[PDB]
């Protein structure tokens, strides 16, 4: 109440609600911040329209009534820094996983300024994250600028969604998400590989778990019992 504008107070308070056995309320605290961020872009571009009809975005549009508009719409800046932990908060919830996937879609699309491409949250497939995007009949109708915008989500959020898809037993989309872990530098993702292989083990996907654990046998930090015990069990 004294300062609604600090990310640390929010993170710690949300963590206390998780230990308070209200992971749902932890996500409820987040939803209000995300909504405030969505509302701020509606307001910022509406103010651009008012300036035309008369942050780096301020430098792009100095004619806007920035004093009143920003004083009215002051907020915590939502981005992938927030969304990776929010995706982990849905993994912590272990309930409403499909709604968690939908929540992550809404957030990831808004970060890229593509939120108006509304069909991506109605369709069941993760097409926007891959070259699959060209195949859906609604994509060819988009503006050239909408086609030029970034669709490239962080590898962290892609793995969080791969884990959530796997929890929903949607194994094809889980592999579609995890494929990028084999394209990126292993040195920056071997910890995610341990989580993916252990989650595959939890999902009874023992052959895939061994495959995902195989890269860890190349580094002294990962040539460990955390890998040898699952390897031996999956082989048993």
């Amino acid at each position: 109440m004294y300062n609604p504008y600090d990310a640390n107070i929010l993170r710690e308070l949300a963590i206390l609600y998780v230990d308070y056995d209200r992971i749902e309320d932890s996500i409820e605290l987040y939803m209000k911040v995300f909504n405030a961020n969505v509302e701020r872009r509606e307001a910022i571009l509406a103010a651009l329209e008012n300036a035309l009809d008369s942050d780096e975005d301020r430098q792009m549009f100095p004619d806007i009534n920035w004093k009143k508009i920003d004083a009215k719409y002051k907020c915590i800046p939502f981005d992938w820094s927030s969304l990776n932990i929010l995706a982990e908060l849905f993994l912590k919830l272990a309930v409403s996983e499909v709604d968690g996937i939908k929540t992550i879609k809404k957030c990831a699309r808004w970060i890229q300024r593509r939120e108006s491409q509304t069909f991506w949250d109605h369709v069941p497939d993760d097409s926007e994250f891959d070259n699959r995007r060209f195949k859906n009949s609604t994509f060819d109708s988009l503006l050239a600028a909408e086609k030029e915008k970034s669709y490239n989500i962080p590898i962290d959020i892609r793995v969080r969604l791969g884990l959530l898809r796997l929890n929903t037993d949607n194994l094809v989309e889980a592999l579609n998400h995890f494929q990028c872990l084999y394209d990126e530098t292993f040195s920056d993702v071997a910890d995610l590989y341990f989580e993916a292989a252990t989650a595959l083990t939890r999902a009874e996907k023992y052959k895939e778990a061994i495959d995902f654990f195989t890269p860890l046998l190349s580094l002294e930090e990962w040539r460990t019992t955390d890998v040898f015990k699952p390897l031996a069990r999956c082989y048993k």
Partner: protein, 518 residues
């Protein structure tokens, strides 16, 4: 002239007066249909089915002729329901667990119960609409209609699907047609926009009446609290009418039914098919080959109960007209196709053909050209005008049995689905309203889609490629066996002007599919 076989009607004007008579107001419609659809070989202009078109033609079914709700139902007979949770719904109706591998052009997907898929872009053009997965055997589908003069959004429309808890096995103790069988089966009611093709499962109704077929919406059952009323024959041997009471929300609901608004039943006999002769009376057939007209206001005793067939009557259909009697047609496992007038069966009964005894014979009425459309129980599609039974014209030949047929009140386009997974479109008016001489070349058909399956890969492999099949007149009947799930179980056009270019079809695995022909 001794006009006694089709070849005697050599002159085109002689054919039209012999098959359609001389009522001046009746002949107008044929001239309008001819000019409005002669060039419509595989598709028709949207501008021709619109309510203001210079070629607009529309014949309402007899159930729509006057308001029926206060006579068929009213506040004295409201349907009895209670709402349920998803856990008990899935305890009875064990809809398919494992996902199906669809392929649609280049796209794979594993598709779960309820996974809508828009058509991916395909090499042969701008495909519009969606594939679905309803999760069990689709036994019937039924589009509702709403009068476009109402305050309801002209682009919103409704569709129902009857779904078995039984699966890709084609022989089961539970799908028996001969003996009475109550069991859990359901109706999924869908709301969709003809403008954006967006669709939501609004209500799921659970009932113990067994499987459901001959499913149709009563277009006269109007009341402000109803979406409409849904009518069907059920495997418990009765005809059940139930109220589709509207929600205060777009959110999904699950329901169970204790008592339908109107149940038609008879002692020691199972009703097998039915059709409306007026807003308040229905003709129906029975296991024992009998036919009866029930009164929806006085359901205690039928108006008549006369024998017309030797065995199970499969389908009954009404040929309504603004100029002739409301004749009824019937086909049975005895193979006879009879046309008769319900005023007096014994003085009017007439035969069109005898087929080989076949255990599914689709028959429908094409009201734009006053002709019944039927499968010969084997592998040909044929047309017969209600007032010239000898004038049987074959429309199309297929390598495997024609299993479902659909037609609309706004246009003469006939859709036929064979148990080889092929779906074909053809213009019936081009056969009926024109000369006999060049029939082997002037009439053709187009394959709109084909399902296929691999025993080892386990995919369903929908092929968008269009194929043209010309009319083989002297052709042999054929019977190529094909994968159990790929047979087409129903096919129907939406019949509103806004939705009139939209159609729906289903295979037997569950892959309901809709397209807007634009």
């Amino acid at each position: 002239r001794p006009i006694r076989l089709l070849k005697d009607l050599s002159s085109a004007r002689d054919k039209i007066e012999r098959i359609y008579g001389l009522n001046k107001e009746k002949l107008l419609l044929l001239a309008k249909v001819k000019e409005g659809f002669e060039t419509s070989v595989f598709d028709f202009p949207f501008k021709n089915i619109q309510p203001d078109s210079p070629y607009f033609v529309c014949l309402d079914p007899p159930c729509k002729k006057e308001s029926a709700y206060n006579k068929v139902i009213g506040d004295k007979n409201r349907t009895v329901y209670h709402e349920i949770n998803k856990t008990e719904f899935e305890n009875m109706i064990k809809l398919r667990t494992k996902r199906l591998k669809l392929l649609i052009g280049e796209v794979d997907a594993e598709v779960s119960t309820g996974d809508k898929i828009e058509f991916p872009v395909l090499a042969n053009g701008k495909r519009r609409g969606f594939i679905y997965n309803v999760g069990g055997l689709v036994t019937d589908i039924a589009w509702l209609n709403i009068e476009e003069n109402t305050d309801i959004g002209k682009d919103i429309q409704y569709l129902a699907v009857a779904v078995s808890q039984y699966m890709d096995e084609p022989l089961n103790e539970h799908l028996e047609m001969f003996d009475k069988e109550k069991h859990s089966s359901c109706i999924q009611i869908f709301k969709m926009n003809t403008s954006t093709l967006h669709c939501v499962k609004v209500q799921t109704i659970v009932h113990s009446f067994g499987e459901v077929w001959d499913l149709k919406w009563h277009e006269g059952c109007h009341a402000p609290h109803l979406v409409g009323c849904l009518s069907f024959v059920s495997q418990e041997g009765t005809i059940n009418f139930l109220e589709i009471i509207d929600n205060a929300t777009d959110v999904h609901v699950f329901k169970m039914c204790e008592k339908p608004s109107l149940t038609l039943s008879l002692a020691d006999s199972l009703i097998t098919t039915f059709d409306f002769l007026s807003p308040t009376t229905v003709v129906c057939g029975f296991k024992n080959g009998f036919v009866a007209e029930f009164d929806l206001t006085d359901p205690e005793v039928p108006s008549f109960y006369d024998q017309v067939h030797d065995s199970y009557i499969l389908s009954v259909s009404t040929a309504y007209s603004d100029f002739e009697d409301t004749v009824v047609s019937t086909v049975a496992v005895d193979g006879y196709f009879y046309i008769f007038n319900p005023k007096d069966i014994a003085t009017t009964k007439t035969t069109v053909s005898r087929f080989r005894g076949s255990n599914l014979v689709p028959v429908v009425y094409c009201p734009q050209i006053y002709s019944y459309i039927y499968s010969d129980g084997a592998s040909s599609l044929r047309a017969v005008p209600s007032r010239a039974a000898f004038a049987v014209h074959p429309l199309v030949s297929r390598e495997t049995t024609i299993t479902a047929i659909g037609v609309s009140r706004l246009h003469p386009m006939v859709l036929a689905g064979s148990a080889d997974g092929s779906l074909i479109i053809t213009n019936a008016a081009r056969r009926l309203l024109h000369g006999i001489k060049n029939s082997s070349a002037t009439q053709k058909s187009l394959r709109l889609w084909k399902w296929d399956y691999s025993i080892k890969d386990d995919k369903y492999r929908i092929d968008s490629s269009y194929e043209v099949y010309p009319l083989t007149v002297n052709d042999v009947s054929k019977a190529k066996i094909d994968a159990h799930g790929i047979n087409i179980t129903c096919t129907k056009w939406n019949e509103t002007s806004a939705g009139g270019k939209c159609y729906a079809f289903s295979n037997s695995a569950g892959l309901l599919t809709l397209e807007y022909l634009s």
